[PDB]
Amino acid sequence: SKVKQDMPPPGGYGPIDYKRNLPRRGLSGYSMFAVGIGALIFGYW
Amino acid sequence: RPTVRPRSDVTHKQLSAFGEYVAEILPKYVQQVQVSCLDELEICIHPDGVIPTLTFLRDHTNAQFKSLADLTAVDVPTRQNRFEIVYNLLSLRFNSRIRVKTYADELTPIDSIVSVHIAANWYEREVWDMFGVFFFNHPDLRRILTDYGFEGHPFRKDFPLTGYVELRYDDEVKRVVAEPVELAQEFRKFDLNSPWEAFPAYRQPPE
Amino acid sequence: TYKYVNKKEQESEVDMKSATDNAARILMWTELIRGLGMTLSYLFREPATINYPFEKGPLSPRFRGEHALRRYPSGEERCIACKLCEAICPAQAITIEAEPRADGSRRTTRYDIDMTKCIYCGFCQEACPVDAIVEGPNFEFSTETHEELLYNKEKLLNNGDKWEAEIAANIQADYLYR
Amino acid sequence: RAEYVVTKLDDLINWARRSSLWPMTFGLACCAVEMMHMAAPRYDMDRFGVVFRASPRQADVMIVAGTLTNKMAPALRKVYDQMPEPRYVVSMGSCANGGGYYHYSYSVVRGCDRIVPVDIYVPGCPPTAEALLYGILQLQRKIKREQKLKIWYRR
Amino acid sequence: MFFINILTLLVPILIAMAFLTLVERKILGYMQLRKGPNIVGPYGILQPFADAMKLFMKEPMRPLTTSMSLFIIAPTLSLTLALSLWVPLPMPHPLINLNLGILFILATSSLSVYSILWSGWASNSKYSLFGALRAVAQTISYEVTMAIILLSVLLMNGSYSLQTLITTQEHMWLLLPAWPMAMMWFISTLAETNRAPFDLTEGESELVSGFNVEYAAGPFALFFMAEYTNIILMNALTTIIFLGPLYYINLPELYSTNFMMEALLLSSTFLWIRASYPRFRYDQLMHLLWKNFLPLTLALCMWHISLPIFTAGVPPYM
Amino acid sequence: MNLYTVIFINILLSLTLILVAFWLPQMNLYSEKANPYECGFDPTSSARLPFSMKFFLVAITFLLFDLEIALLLPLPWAIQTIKTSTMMIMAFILVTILSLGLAYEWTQKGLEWTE
Ligand SMILES: COC1=C(OC)C(=O)C(C/C=C(\C)CC/C=C(\C)CC/C=C(\C)CC/C=C(/C)CC/C=C(/C)CC/C=C(\C)CC/C=C(\C)CC/C=C(\C)CC/C=C(/C)CCC=C(C)C)=C(C)C1=O
Ligand SMILES: CCCCCCCCCCCCCCCCCC(=O)OC[C@H](COP(=O)([O-])OCC[N+](C)(C)C)OC(=O)CCCCCCCCCCCCCCCCC
Ligand SMILES: CCCCCCCCCCCCCCCCCC(=O)OC[C@H](COP(=O)(O)OCCN)OC(=O)CCCCCCCCCCCCCCCCC
Ligand code: SF4
Ligand code: SF4
Ligand code: SF4
C-alpha cells in the first residue's frame, strides 16, 4: 500500500488562458458609412 | 523544526530601534514601549498625548503611518482604568505596523483623532457604543451598532451575553415591544480551564 | 509586480481613417451590437437548468445534512453518553442527559438537537469517538412548524434507522480522509 | 352539488396562487446569498414561476433569509404588514428559524416567528438552494391544501 | 358586426400581450443560461393566466395617505389609452380610419404619460414622487424628438394617415430612405414605452418600484397590461411606418402575416435590448437626446424638407 | 359614432377590470398595512414637501420647442403649395432659428441641470 493522495499529473497541468481576449472584428468605418450613404441615395431615388 | 515558526530577529531589532526612537522623541507621553516575540511594536502612552502621538505618527518623515487600520477597546475590569484603547496603524512607505495603547475609565474621555484620521469617526462611534468611552470633539458622536433605544454598552465584561431585554411582536398594541429577557434554554457556561498551568514563562509571582 | 488597467501608453495621434473608425463606432453603435450578439449566442446556447425534483443537484459524501444517531451492526446504539459533541457544539444545540441503563451500560436518556439552533458544522460528527452522531445527506426535511425541528433522541434514532443504508456507505467512502 | 363546484373553484384559486408566487426582494445574510443561488440558472425559480418583486405591495411570500436583529425587527414587521392579504412567510436558515449561532446574543430576535407568523421553516446554515426550493414547493403544496371556499360554504 | 370587429381587435391584443409576458420571461431566461416557465402550462403557456388570476384575487389594499380618486383613475386611464392607441392601426385596413392618425397616436401617448404622473402623485409616497418626476423628464426628451422624427418621415410620406404609408411603402421600405430616423425612432419608442435601457419610471434598482410602489395587485396588473400593450403597439407602429409589409389588393392576408412577423421581430428586439444593456441615468437620457438626437433630427428634418423640392418628388395629397 | 363606441367600450372594460379587482378578493385593512411604504420605516417627511427639480430651464425650453413643433407640423400640407420657394425658405429659416436657440442654450449651459 503506497501513499495515494490528490496530486497533479507528473507532467503538470496544461496551459490555462487568463489574459483578456476580445475578437477584434467589424467592418471599417469607411465601408459602413459608404453602405449607409448608398442606401440613402438608393432610397431617395 | 517543521512545526515551529521562524523568528526574524532582524525585524525584531528594527522594531526595537524604532521604539527607542519614538520613546525619546516623545518622552512627555510615552509610558511604555514593548516589542512582542511576534514582532509587533506596542507603544503605551498617556491619554493626554493621543493627538500629538497620532499626529507625529501620521506625518513624520521617518514614521509615515498615514493609514489607520484599527481602533478598538479592550475591557479589563480589574485595573483602575478599565478600558484599553488600541490603535493599529499601517505604514505603506516603510511597510510596517505599529500599535498605540492608551487607557480610560467610565468617566474619563479621550480626545478623538478625527482631525488626524477620518476612519476614527466611525471607529470611535463604535468604541463609544460598545464600551461607553466618550470622545471629545467628535462630530456627531452617537450609537452605530446597537438598537436605537438600547441601554447599556454590551461589549463590557459586566454586560450579559443575552442582554436585559428582548423583542417580540405584541398583537394587543400591534407593535414590536421589549420585555425582560426570559430564555427557554439558559446558556450553559462551561468551566474549560485546566487546573494545571500550560505556560511557565507567564507564571505570575505569588501575592 | 503591477499593471495598469486604464492608463494608455502615448497616443495614436489623429488620422482620417482612425477618426472615421471612431465616428462609425459612435454613430453605428458597434459595441452595443456586439453585446447584442453576445446575448444572442447565449440565447442559442443550452441552458444549465436542471429539472429539480426529478434531477437533483450533485453532492459529495462529505455533505452535512440532517443529524442521525447510528448503531452497531448488533443493533446496539453507538452513543456512550460522553457529551463531548455538546462540549464542542459551537451553538450549544445539543442536550445529553444520561444515566446508567438497566444492564448497566453508559447510555443517554435525553439527546436533543435543536435544528433551529444548530449551524450544521459537523463538529459533533468529527468529535464523536464512536461515530455515533453523524450528519447524513438529508436536506429536504423542511417543516411547517418550529417544534418539528426540535429533535429528541427518538427522532434522531429514527433518522439513523432510516438513513443507515446511505450514511454507512458515505462513511465507508469517506473515513480514510478523516 | 354545490360542494363539488365549490371544491373545484377552490382548487382553481389555489392553483393560481401556487403557480404565481412572487417573493419579495428582501434578504439579510448568507441565507439570502443562497436565495439568489436559488434564483441562479441551475434551480430556476422563474421556471417554477417564482419571481422576485421589490415592493411588498407586489409580493406574496416573505423569505426571511438571515439574522433578524433587534434593530431590524420593526422594519421586518412593517414590511410584512405592508403586504396584501394572501401573504406567506418562509423562514430560511437557523438564524431566522430559532436564532441559530446568535441565539444568545443581546441583539438577535430568537427566531422570526416571534415577529411574524411563519408558514414554512427551512433548516440549514445555510440551507442549500435545493433545500430552499424544496421549502418553496412545500409551501406550494401547503397552499394547495387550503380550502377557503369550502370553509366559507360550510360556514 | 362592428362590435364583433371590436372584439376581434381587443381580445387577440390582450392574449398577445399576455403571451408577450411569457415570451419575455422565456427569452430573458434563455439569454441568461436558464429556462423560462415550463411547469404551469405544457410549455409555460398557462403562466400568464396564473399570474393574472393571482393578481386579480389579491386585495387592492387602498392606502391611507393616498388621493383615492386619482389613485383609481390612473391605471384604468392607462389601459383604455393603450387600447385606444391600438384602435387606428391598419393591417392593412384599420378598425377606425383617421386622417390624422399619427397626431392621434401622439396625443394618446402623452395622455398615457399623464396616467403615470397622476398615479405617482396620488400614491403619496416619496418613491412614487421620484418615479413621477423621472417620467416628466423622460417624456420631455422623447416628446420633442418623436415629434421631429414623425414630421420628417411623414413629409417623405403624404398626409398624416397610415394607408398612405402602406401605399408609400408599396414598392420599397422607408428604412432605406430614412434609416437614421428609424434608429432614432426605435430609441424614442423605447423611451416612450419606458423600457430598458432607460426605463427609469419603474426603476427596480434606483427606486424600489417607482410609481407602482404603492399599487398592490389589481390596478398594478392594469398598469402592466397597459405597458406591455404599448410595447407591442410601438413595435407595430415602427413596422408600419418603416418596415413596410407587402401589400396586394387581391389578398391582405400576406400583409397581415408580414406585419405579424416584423412586429414579433421588433418585440423580441425589445426583450433583447433589455437583456443586453444596463440602465441610463435619467439626466443622461435627457443629455443624450437633447445633445445627440435633437440636433441631428433638426438637420435631417431640414434635409427632408429640401429633398422633395430639389428632387421634385413631392408626395400627393391623397 | 364608431370611434366613440370603441372609446366607451375600452373605458368600460378598464372599469370592469378594476371593479372586479376591488369586489372579488377578501379585504383585511388595518393601519400598519395601509401606511406609506418608505422601505420599512416611518417616513420623516409628508411626501408633499417641495421637491426642487433641477431641469426647470429644460422644461421651459421644452414648452417653447413644443410650440415650434406645432408650427412645423403643417408641413405635409405646406409642401403642396404653388409657390414652394417661399415655403422652402420659410421652413429653412424656422428650423435654423430653432437650432440657433438650442445652440445658444447649450453654449450658455442652460440644459446642464444646475444643482
Ligand atoms: C452582500 O450583500 C448583499 C446584497 O448585495 C449584493 C444583497 O443584494 C442582499 C439581498 C439579496 C437578495 C434579496 C436576493 C434576491 C435575488 C436577486 C436580487 C437576484 C435575482 C434576479 C433578479 C431580481 C432579476 C430578475 C430578472 C429577470 C429578467 C426576471 C424577470 C422579472 C420580471 C419582474 C419581469 C417579467 C414579469 C413578470 C415576472 C410578471 C409578468 C406577468 C404579469 C404581471 C401578468 C399580467 C397579465 C395580465 C393581467 C393579463 C390578463 C388578461 C387576459 C386577457 C388573460 C386572460 C385570462 C383568462 C383567465 C382567460 C443581501 C442580503 C446581501 O447581503
Ligand atoms: C427600427 C429599425 C431598427 C433600428 C435599430 C435597432 C437595432 C439596434 C439596437 C442597438 C441598441 C440600442 C439600445 C439603446 C442604446 C442607447 C445609446 C445610444 O444609442 O446612444 C446614441 C449614441 C450617442 O453616442 P454617445 O452618447 O456615446 O456620444 C458621445 C457624445 N458625448 C461625448 C457628447 C457624450 O449615438 C448617436 O447619437 C447616433 C445616432 C444615430 C446617428 C446616425 C447617423 C447616420 C449617418 C448620417 C449621414 C452621414 C454622412 C454625412 C453627409 C455625407 C454627404 C456625402
Ligand atoms: C378613465 C377616463 C378616460 C377619459 C379619457 C379618454 C381618452 C380617450 C382616448 C384618447 C383620445 C384623444 C383624442 C382623440 C380625439 C379623436 C381623434 C380624431 O381625429 O377624431 C376625429 C375622427 C373623425 O375625423 P377624421 O379622421 O377626419 O374623419 C373624417 C372622415 N373620415 O373621429 C371623430 O370625429 C369621433 C369623435 C369622438 C372621439 C372621442 C370620443 C371620446 C368619448 C369620451 C370619453 C371620456 C368620457 C368621460 C369619462 C367616462 C367615465 C370614466
Ligand atoms: S453540526 Fe455543529 S452546530 Fe450542529 S449540532 Fe453538530 S456541533 Fe452543533
Ligand atoms: S453522540 Fe458521540 S460525542 Fe456525543 S455524547 Fe454520544 S458518544 Fe459522545
Ligand atoms: S443561518 Fe447560517 S447561513 Fe443563514 S443567515 Fe444565519 S449564519 Fe448565515
Question: For atom 7 of ligand 5, which residue has the closest CA?
Answer: C79
Domain with F111 in it = 2-115
What letter does residue B35 receive in the DSSP assignment? E
Q: For chain F, report the end-to-end CA distance as a whole number of angstroms.
A: 51
Residue nearest to atom 48 of ligand 3 (CA): F11
How many other C-beta atoms are found inside a 10 Å radius of the C-beta of residue A20?
A: 5
DSSP-derived 3-state class of residue F10? helix
Name the DSSP class of E173: -
Give just the sign of the alpha carbon dihedral D42, E207, E278, E85: positive
Coil/strand/helix, residue C147: helix
Cell match 515551529: residue?
Answer: B4
Total domains, chain E: 1
| Chains in contact with chain B (at least 3 beta-carbon pairs closer than 8 A) | C, D, F
The CB of D83 under 6 Å from ligand 6? The reply is no
CB contact under 8 A, E144 and F69: yes
Residues near D57 by Cβ (< 8 Å), separated by ≥ 6? Answer: D82, D83, D84, E61, E209, E212, E213, E214, E215, E216, E217, E220, F37
| Cβ partners under 8 Å of residue F53, min gap 6 | E133, E136, F59
Inter-chain CB proximity C49 and D121 less than 8 Å = no
CB E286 within 8 A of CB E140: yes
Alpha carbon distances (Å) from C60 to C55, C65, C66, C173, C174: 16, 11, 14, 10, 10
Identify which of C70, C79, C113 has the alpha carbon closest to the alpha carbon of residue C95: C113
Residues E111, E112, E113, E117: is their CA dihedral positive or negative? Answer: positive
Amino acid, res. C50? I
What CATH number does residue F106 fall under? 1.20.58.1610
Are C64 and D128 in contact, with CB atoms under 8 Å apart?
A: no
Q: How far is the CA of A13 from the CAs of A5, A10, D21, D27, in angstroms?
A: 16, 9, 47, 41
Give the resolution value in Å. 3.0
Number of other residues whose CB lies within 10 A of the CB of residue E218 = 25
Q: Report yes or no: D41 and C49 within 8 Å, Cβ to Cβ.
A: yes
Q: Is F43 exposed, middle or buried (0-12, 13-18, 19+ CB in 10 A)?
A: middle
The rounded distance, in Å, linking the Cα atoms of E135 and E131 is 6
Residue with CA nearest ligand 1 atom 50: E52
Q: How many Å apart are CA E35 and CA E40, to the nearest integer?
A: 13
Ligand nearest to the CA of E161: 3
Angstrom distance (rounded) from CA B76 to CA D10: 65
- Determine contact, residues B52/B26, Cβ cutoff 8 Å: yes
Report the residue count for chain F: 115
CA atoms of D139 and D119, how far apart (whole Å) = 8
Q: What single DSSP character describes residue C143?
A: B
Burial class (CB in 10 A: 0-12, 13-18, 19+), C14: exposed
DSSP state of B136: E
**What is the separation of C-alpha B165 from the centre of its chain, rounded to a whole number of angstroms?**
27
Residue with cell string 426628451: E141
Q: Which atom of ligand 6 is nearest to the CA of D32?
A: 5
Technique of determination: cryo-EM
- CA F69/CA A25 separation, integer angstroms: 42
Q: How far apart are CA D11 and CA D149, in angstroms?
A: 9
Q: Give the Cα separation of E228 and E233 in Å (integer).
A: 8
Closest CA to B166 of D119, C70, D105: D105
DSSP E95-145: SS--SSHHHHHHHHHHHHHHHHHHHHHHB-SHHHHHHHHHHHHHHHHHHHH
Q: What is the DSSP letter of B168?
A: E
Query: Within a 10 A sphere around the Cβ of B192, how many other Cβ atoms?
Result: 6
Contact between chains at B185 and C87 (C-beta distance less than 8 A): no
Measured CA to CA, the distance from residue E300 to residue B127 in angstroms comes to 65
Our CA-based measurement puts residue E166 at a distance from the nearest CA of chain F, in whole angstroms, of 17
Exposure of F15 by Cβ count < 10 A (0-12 exposed, 13-18 middle, 19+ buried)? middle
- How close is the Cα of D102 to the center of ligand 6, in Å? 9
Provide the 10 A C-beta neighbour count for residue E95: 19
Helix (H) or strand (E) holding B170: strand B165-170
Query: D117-150 burial, b for 16+ CB within 10 Å, e for fewer?
Result: ebbbbbbbbbbbbbbbbbbbbbbbeebeebeebb
Cβ–Cβ contact E36 with D under 8 A:
yes
Give the chain F residue whose CA is nearest to the CA of E59: F25
| Ligand 6 binding pocket includes D31 (Cβ within 6 Å) | yes
- The residues with which B87 forms a beta bridge, in sequence order, are B71, B100
Q: Write the DSSP assignment of chain D as a string of letters.
A: -HHHHHHHHHHHHHHHHHHS--BBS---SHHHHHHHHHHSSTT-TTTTT---BSSGGG-SEEEEES--BTTTHHHHHHHHHTS-SS-EEEEEHHHHHH-GGGTT-TTB-S-GGGTS--SEEE-SSSPPHHHHHHHHHHHHHHHHS--HHHHHHT-
The answer to whether E58 and E88 have CB atoms below 8 angstroms apart is no
CA distance F99 to D90: 59
Q: Assess contact for C34 and E276: CB atoms under 8 A.
A: no
Cβ distance of D56 and F37 shorter than 8 Å:
yes
Mutate which of E187, E264, E296 for ligand 2? The one with the most ligand atoms within 8 Å of its CB, which is E187
Interatomic CA distance for residues C91 and C89, integer angstroms: 6
Q: To test ligand 2's pocket by mutation, which of E288, E303, E304 has the most ligand atoms within 8 angstroms of CB? A: E288
Which three three-digit cell numbers place residue C76? 446496539
Edge-to-edge strand list for the sheet holding B30-35: B30-35, B41-45, B96-104, B83-91, B67-75
D1-155: CATH architecture? 3-Layer(aba) Sandwich (3.40)
Number of domains in chain F: 1
Residue D5, C-alpha cell as written in the block: 363546484
Residues 6+ apart with CB under 8 A from A14: none
- D32-38: long-range contacts, CB 8 A cutoff, minimum separation 24: D32/D63, D32/D65, D32/D66, D33/D126, D34/D65, D34/D92, D34/D93, D34/D126, D34/D127, D34/D128, D34/D129, D34/D132, D35/D63, D35/D65, D35/D92, D35/D129, D35/D132, D37/D129, D38/D129, D38/D132, D38/D133, D38/D136
Cα four-point dihedral sign E77, E81, E82, E83:
positive
What phi, psi does D137 have (nearest 5°)?
-70, -35
**Which residue type sits at C98?**
A
- Rounded to the nearest 10°, the torsion over CA B112, B118, B119, B121 is 40
Residue D119 near residue D138 (C-beta atoms within 8 A) = no
Cβ(C120) to ligand 4 under 6 A? Answer: yes
Q: Where are the domains of chain D?
A: 1-155
